[PDB]
Design a protein around this nucleic acid. Structure first.
Ligand SMILES: [K+]
Ligand SMILES: [K+]
Ligand SMILES: [K+]
Ligand SMILES: [K+]
Ligand SMILES: [K+]
Ligand SMILES: [Mg+2]
Ligand SMILES: [Mg+2]
Ligand SMILES: [Mg+2]
Ligand SMILES: [Mg+2]
Ligand SMILES: [Mg+2]
Ligand SMILES: [Mg+2]
Ligand SMILES: [Mg+2]
Ligand SMILES: [Mg+2]
Ligand SMILES: [Mg+2]
Ligand SMILES: [Mg+2]
Ligand SMILES: [Mg+2]
Ligand SMILES: [Mg+2]
Ligand SMILES: [Mg+2]
Ligand SMILES: [Mg+2]
Ligand SMILES: [Mg+2]
Ligand SMILES: [Mg+2]
Ligand SMILES: [Mg+2]
Ligand SMILES: [Mg+2]
Ligand SMILES: [Mg+2]
Ligand SMILES: [Mg+2]
Ligand SMILES: [Mg+2]
Lengths: 47, 108, 37, 353, 46, 76, 95
RNA sequence: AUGUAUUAAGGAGAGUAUAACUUAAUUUAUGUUUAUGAUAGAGGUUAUCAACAUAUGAACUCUUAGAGAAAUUACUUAAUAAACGAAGUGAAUUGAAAUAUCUUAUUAACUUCAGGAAAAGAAAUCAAACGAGAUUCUAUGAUUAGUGUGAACGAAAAUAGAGCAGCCUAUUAAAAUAAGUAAAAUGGCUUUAAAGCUGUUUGAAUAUUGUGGGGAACCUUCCUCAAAGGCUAAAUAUAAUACAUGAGUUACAGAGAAAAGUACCGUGAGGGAAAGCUUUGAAAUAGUAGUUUU
């Protein structure tokens, strides 16, 4: 049972990261400090 | 309330097929299974939801009200008082109960 | 204003049995005669 | 889409309605099996109460011929020896209803806010061993029974032969357990008049200053005596000894942080997401733009199919509709203050004079 | 009297006559299913 | 595939169902593998075999008596 | 036949062309002469990483008490896409 | 059983911590109040010793792509029971102490179509010389008018209650005010002969400056309404859920089902059980004992 609770937790954190990253991309498209076009330097610290 | 109800042979669940043949089995000839003579058959004259209320003339109902009010008057059991008929509970208790210092267990 | 009804006072902390150092004290072996509160 | 949510909401209700019908049927089967298992403890007690009604009439009648019932064979109904209980009835391990656990604990909080702990002396107030005083050793929170390791609460019990050697004596004396309702708390208080400490019996306890810790799922409260407000400290309870096993991960590794968020590549291979959730489940709420775009065009293809007969209209049918649109833009005329003042005169003249 | 009318019976003819697909796929078989379904039957066919 | 006996939902009550069958696979290893032999009954004390045996015989004798009652008979 | 006839039919009961699978997946296609061609694009493989040197085990010592995360004041604490994007900038700006 | 409120697609197969439900089968977070609550400890399996409110991960197969011997194949972000409603078709048992008209009966049933309700609906309506003012539901009116040889069948006006809402610029997008129509003959339906529905053959008029319909054969005057174009919530029907009440039941009762459409029976459609708890222990029946007779 304890081995099955670690296997369940792994599937909860991976499902959480996929959805969190799938939204950050959208939220990062409307950000003025991120340029998704160029991958070499896609972020510039705001002044 | 008069809401009691019972199922007759025309309301009991099941099929209305004939149980045993009219003749040939030797047993008493039987019809449907919902007959009162069967185990789970319906009660013929069972209770049903109806109205038990009756009628009483307004004048006869008013005479009965003043007769019960006079039966108490002649026996001295009719004690009329002035307006504001409330229990004169102590003021201290009312001040504490309203304030909320006293718990329910003590207030009651 | 003072009232004529005594209400339960503020809570107090009862000393734990191990901390009691009173010489004139002995645990009760039988429950008969002990006050119930 | 708003139509895709109704699909999910409807599915979530169909499954929850089926889980209740199954759970209900199981609650009734499990209850019917316990009641029949507890009934064997009720039957043994009923059979021993009547056996005592006949054993006392014989000691009265026979006199010097009184039998030696201790040397008799067991009772084949329950399999117990003379003057001995059964493990189920001596340990009080039979499950009780939920309205019983609340009644047994009614005097000390509630089944989930119990105000008595192991290590605190109590006084028995029921049974043969009334007014006895002992210290709680165990505290069974399932049946709300308490074990007091006193030599007076011992009682013969018949040991089942499936857990007993062949030279072992069939009957042994074990410590009998009592329900929580049959014991009250004994705590020494100070005499406010003289300052002398004496023992008293606490008839009721209630929790106070309850505070929960959501991150740890813990709580800490205080127990006090209602009516007198005497906060009684908790008894000295030793925490369980937690140890590090060889199969457990070291503390240095469990604390290592290796996750670095990414934005241009997924946190894991995109194929893994198909294993975490079912792509085709009717409970999927996170759809792709290409899908929602295809779902919204099903209605757009119906409003264009409902209004597809607008190309077969006759000139008079088109003229009428065209006029209707123009008219609905005019609106409704309004009554100016001058017009309202003239209407008020008519009303007052025809009502008052 | 009753006869041994099920001697030599095969379970392939049982699925072709009183099977689930013989009923969902016919107008008269959809009624039998709904009736047994409305009554509470677990065994809608075969 | 190993099939499973058909049974009733609740042992002796309920509709007749059939559990999910079992699948066994036998692989032809390229390197031989030999299992160890079971420990002797007297050397299984780590598993509490003594107590386990007494409990097993008890259930064995209660299952046998419940089969004698299923034949419509009793032990004289 | 009285009762067994009413159970659900299985492949271990009848043989006259009755086939029923166990949902093992299609690994290829059928040929016209009764053979089978395995399409290895449908065959599935299991990606097991090298476990030499891996120190994490499936258990954590009971000394370290279980604690959750607070995320105070953020309703969508663990799922907030803002705390995932802002956290990304400081730690990993390039990727 | 009734009432109130809310809701408007249902079932099965297999698996799983056997209070916990979907291969993640006891997910993860927020806010508030915590004994003056709500209605200064121990305890992560020796667990869930916390309720309320709001979010949240996961949620398999079939019914339900195509094929097929439902829960398989093969593919894929393929997916909606019953009752209730409208129309079409439309019996027989039964009564008439037989029986044809009639009644049973605009019934049961089937068929199609549709929605959470549907249908109907703002007068070509009723009234009677005064006037009322859409539809739906309930009672009275009414074992009435009336019809029919009979047996029986059976309105409306009006009144009271539940709801109330009007419009075409319809609060969702519709009329340039309705012609093979109104109506007539004939064959049927409904029915009192009118009005209404209808197959066949025929076939009008254009507003109170009196054109058209109706007012129970029919004609006329008057009154009244304005067909051949439309929209419209509520009160009503059914099912599920929850709750309230009881001179309702308390285990052969209540329901068919206190574990049920299950076991069981049937090729099938279909038929369809028994079984509560620890209390009390009646009669019949059986084996003996005491007194007594044989
Ligand atoms: K006659
Ligand atoms: K008449
Ligand atoms: K006519
Ligand atoms: K019954
Ligand atoms: K008896
Ligand atoms: Mg019949
Ligand atoms: Mg009955
Ligand atoms: Mg009376
Ligand atoms: Mg603590
Ligand atoms: Mg999964
Ligand atoms: Mg989801
Ligand atoms: Mg024959
Ligand atoms: Mg043959
Ligand atoms: Mg075989
Ligand atoms: Mg065979
Ligand atoms: Mg074949
Ligand atoms: Mg199909
Ligand atoms: Mg399919
Ligand atoms: Mg009427
Ligand atoms: Mg007109
Ligand atoms: Mg006409
Ligand atoms: Mg006329
Ligand atoms: Mg006409
Ligand atoms: Mg009009
Ligand atoms: Mg009664
Ligand atoms: Mg009875």
């Amino acid at each position: 049972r304890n081995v099955k609770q670690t296997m369940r937790g792994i599937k909860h954190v991976l499902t959480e990261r996929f959805y969190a990253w799938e939204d950050a991309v959208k939220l990062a498209e409307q950000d003025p400090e991120i340029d998704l076009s160029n991958p070499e330097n896609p972020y510039t610290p705001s002044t | 309330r008069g809401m009691a109800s019972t199922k007759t042979r025309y309301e009991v669940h099941g099929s209305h097929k004939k149980m045993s043949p009219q003749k040939g089995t030797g047993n008493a000839r039987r019809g449907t299974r919902q007959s009162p003579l069967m185990k789970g058959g319906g009660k013929t004259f069972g209770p049903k939801p109806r109205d038990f209320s009756t009628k009483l003339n307004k004048k006869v109902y008013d005479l009965a009200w003043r007769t019960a009010l006079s039966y108490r008057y002649k026996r001295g059991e009719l004690i009329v008082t002035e307006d504001g008929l409330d229990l004169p509970l102590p003021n201290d208790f009312l001040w504490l109960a309203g304030g909320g210092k006293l718990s329910r267990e003590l207030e009651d | 204003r003072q009232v004529n009804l005594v209400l339960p006072g503020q809570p107090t902390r009862a000393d734990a049995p191990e901390k009691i150092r009173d010489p004139n004290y002995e645990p009760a072996t039988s429950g008969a005669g002990l006050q119930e509160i | 889409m708003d139509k895709l949510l109704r699909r999910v909401r409807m599915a979530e209700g169909m499954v929850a309605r089926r889980a209740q019908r199954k759970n209900a049927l199981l609650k009734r089967i499990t209850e019917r099996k316990q009641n029949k298992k507890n009934g064997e403890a009720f039957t043994e007690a009923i059979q021993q109460r009547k056996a005592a009604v006949e054993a006392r009439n014989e000691d009265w009648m026979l006199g010097p011929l009184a039998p030696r019932r201790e040397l008799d064979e067991i009772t084949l109904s329950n399999g117990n020896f003379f003057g001995s209980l059964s493990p189920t009835r001596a340990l009080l391990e039979s499950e009780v209803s939920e309205e019983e656990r609340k009644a047994r604990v009614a005097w000390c909080g509630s089944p989930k806010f119990l105000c008595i702990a192991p290590g605190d002396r109590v006084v028995v107030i029921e049974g043969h061993h009334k007014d006895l005083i002992g210290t709680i050793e165990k505290l069974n929170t399932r049946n709300m029974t308490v074990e007091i390791q006193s030599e007076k609460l011992k009682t013969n019990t018949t040991v089942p032969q499936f857990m007993q050697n062949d030279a072992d004596k069939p009957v042994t004396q074990i410590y009998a357990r009592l329900p929580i309702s049959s014991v009250r708390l004994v705590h020494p208080l100070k005499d406010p008049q003289t300052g002398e400490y004496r023992d008293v019996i606490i008839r009721e306890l209630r929790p106070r200053n309850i505070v929960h810790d959501r991150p740890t799922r813990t709580r800490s409260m205080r127990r006090f005596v209602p009516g007198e407000n005497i906060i009684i400290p908790w008894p000295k309870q030793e925490p369980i000894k937690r140890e590090d096993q060889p199969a457990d991960t070291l503390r240095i590794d469990v604390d290592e942080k290796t996750f670095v968020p990414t934005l241009f590549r997924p946190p894991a291979p995109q194929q893994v997401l198909d294993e975490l959730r079912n792509k085709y489940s009717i409970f999927r709420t996170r759809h792709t733009p290409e899908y929602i775009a295809k779902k919204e065009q099903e209605e757009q293809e119906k409003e264009a199919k409902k209004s597809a007969a607008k190309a077969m209209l006759t000139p008079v049918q088109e003229y009428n509709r065209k006029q209707r649109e123009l008219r609905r833009a005019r609106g409704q005329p309004a009554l100016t203050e001058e017009m309202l003042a003239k209407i008020g005169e008519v009303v007052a003249r025809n009502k008052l004079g | 009297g009753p006869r041994p009318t099920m001697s030599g019976a095969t379970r392939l003819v049982q699925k072709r006559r009183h099977g689930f697909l013989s009923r969902v796929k016919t107008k008269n078989g959809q009624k039998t299913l709904k009736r047994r379904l409305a009554k509470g039957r677990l065994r809608l066919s075969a | 595939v190993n099939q499973r006996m058909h049974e009733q939902r609740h042992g002796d009550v309920g509709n007749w169902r059939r559990p999910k069958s079992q699948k066994m696979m036998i692989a032809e290893l390229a390197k031989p593998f030999v299992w160890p032999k079971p420990p002797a009954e007297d050397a299984r004390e780590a598993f509490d075999y003594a107590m386990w045996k007494k409990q097993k015989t008890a259930q064995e004798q209660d299952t046998k008596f419940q089969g004698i009652r299923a034949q419509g008979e009793v032990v004289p | 036949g009285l009762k067994y006839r009413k159970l659900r039919l299985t492949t271990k009961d009848v043989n006259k062309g009755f086939y029923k699978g166990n949902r093992t997946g299609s690994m290829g296609t059928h040929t016209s002469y009764g053979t089978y061609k395995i399409d290895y694009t449908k065959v599935r493989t299991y990606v097991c990483p090298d476990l030499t040197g891996f120190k994490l085990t499936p258990f954590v010592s009971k000394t370290i008490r279980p604690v959750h995360d607070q995320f105070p004041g953020d309703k969508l604490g663990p799922k907030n896409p803002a705390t995932y994007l802002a956290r990304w900038k400081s730690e990993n700006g390039l990727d």
